[PDB]
Specification:
The structure is a homododecamer.
Chain A: E1 2-4, E2 7-9, E3 12-20, E4 23-25, E5 28-30, E6 38-41, E7 46-47, E8 50-52, E9 61-63
Family (chains A, B, C, D, E, F, G, H, I, J, K, L): Belongs to the synuclein family.
Region (4 X 11 AA tandem repeats of [EGS]-K-T-K-[EQ]-[GQ]-V-X(4)) (chains A, B, C, D, E, F, G, H, I, J, K, L): 6-42
Protein name (chains A, B, C, D, E, F, G, H, I, J, K, L): Alpha-synuclein
Chain lengths: 72, 72, 72, 72, 72, 72, 72, 72, 72, 72, 72, 72
């Protein structure tokens, strides 16, 4: 679970959204008259009508994650 | 769970949103007459109509996360 | 759970929002006549119509998090 | 749970919001005639119509967090 | 739970809000005829129509937090 | 779970969205009169009408993840 | 232009209005940088959101009117 | 132009209106940079969102009108 | 222009109005930088959000009017 | 132009309106940079979203009108 | 132009309207950069989304009208 | 132009409308850069999404009209 990014030194980014009656549901748990429900979310969740990820790593960049589930 | 980012040294970013009746639900638990529900969220959740992540790492950048679930 | 970021030295950022009847629900637990509900949230949750994260790491930057759940 | 950020040395940021009947609910627990509910929130939650996070780390910056749940 | 940030040395930030009938609810617990409810909040929660966090770390900056729950 | 990216040194990005009655559901669990449901999500999930990932790695960039499930 | 109504002898009326931002313009003359305008109105004009005319003639009733325009 | 109504002798009326942003324009003359306009109205004009005319003649009732235009 | 009504002999009326930001303009002449305007009104004009005319003629009733315009 | 109605003697009326952003324009003259316009209206004009005319003649009822236009 | 209706003597009426963004234009004259326009209307014009005319003549009822146009 | 209706003596009417973005244009004259237009309307014009005419003549009822156009 180690992330390293070292940088040694010796544009137009447009997002245009025009929505009418836009409904966004991310991590959602909807139920009625149920018994049990498990919602295990361990990561980076992006949800939406205009989901833009521009130039996420431009220089030295390190991305890491770790999830698990132990029930025995 | 270690993050390191060292930087040694020796633009236009536009977001335009125009929404009409925009409904955003992030981490939501909706129920009626239910018995049990588990909502385990351990990460960075982005939810919405105009979800823009521009130039998230520009220089030296380190991103890390760690989730788990132990019930035995 | 260690974050380190060292920097040694030897633009226009616009967000425009125009919403009509905008409803945002973040971490929400809505119920009626239910018995039990668990809402375990341990991370950085961003929820909304104009959710903009511009230049989150520009220089030396370190991001980390750690979540868990022990019930035995 | 250690955060370190050392910096050694030897723009226009606009947010424009125009909302009509804007309703924002953050960490909310709404119920009627229920028995038990648990709302465990341990992280930095951002909720709203114009949620802007610009230049969060510009120089040397360290971000960390730690959550848990023990019931046995 | 240690935060350190040392800095050794040897722009226009605009927020514009124009809201009509804006309702903001932060950490809220609304109930009627219920039995028990637990609202455990241990982190920095930002809730609102114009939620702007500009230049949160500009120089040397250290952010940390720690939450927990023990019931046995 | 180690990510490393080191960089040593010695354009127009447009997204245009115009949606009418756009409904986005990300990680969603919808049920009625059910008994048990498991929703195990450990990765970076992108969901939406205009899902754009431009120039995700531009310089030195490292991406990693790790998921698991133990029930015994 | 003669009206006569002679009567020889030998209930619940509900109006319910609930308006939000109701704008009513009756006989209106709106102009800018114009030269000439003629507004000749000679009759009974009813204008409005809840325009109710219940039981206008219940017994002996006589209604008459007369308009004209002479310019030669 | 004679109206006569003679009567010799020897219920629930509900109107329910619930409007949101209701705009009513009756006899209206809107112009800009025009030269001449004639608005000749000689009759009973009813204009509106809830225009109800219930039981206008219940007993002996006489309705009459007369309009004209002479220019030669 | 003669009105006659002779009567020889030998209920609940409810109006309910609940308005928010209600604007009523009756006989109105609005102008800017204009030259000439004529507003000739000779009749009974009723203008408004809750314009109710209940039981206008109940017994012997006579209504009459007369308008004209001579310019030669 | 004579109306006569003589009567010799020897229920639930519901209107329900629920409108959202309802715009009603009756007798309207809209122009820009025009030269001449004639609007000759001599009759009973009913204009609107919920235009109800119930039981207009119930007993003895007489309706008449007369219009004309002379220009020579 | 004579109307006569004599009557000698010896139910549920429901209208339900539920509109969203309802636009009604009755007698309308819309122009730009035009020269001349004639709008001659002499009759009873009913215009709208829910235009209901129930039981217009129930007893003795007389309806008449007369229009013309002379230009020579 | 004579109407007569004499009556000598010796149910559920439902209209249900549910419209979304309903646009009704009755007698309309729309033009741009035109020279001349004539709109001669002399009759009873009914225009709309839910145009219902139920039981227009139930008892003794007389309907008449007369139009013309003289230009020579």
């Amino acid at each position: 679970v180690v992330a390293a990014a070292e940088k040694t030194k010796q544009g137009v980014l447009y997002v245009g959204s025009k929505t009418k009656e836009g409904v966004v549901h991310g991590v959602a748990t909807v139920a009625e008259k149920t018994k049990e429900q498990v919602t295990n979310v361990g990561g980076a969740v992006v949800t939406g009508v205009t989901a833009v990820a521009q130039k996420t790593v431009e220089g030295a960049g390190s991305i890491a994650a770790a999830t698990g589930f132990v029930k025995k």
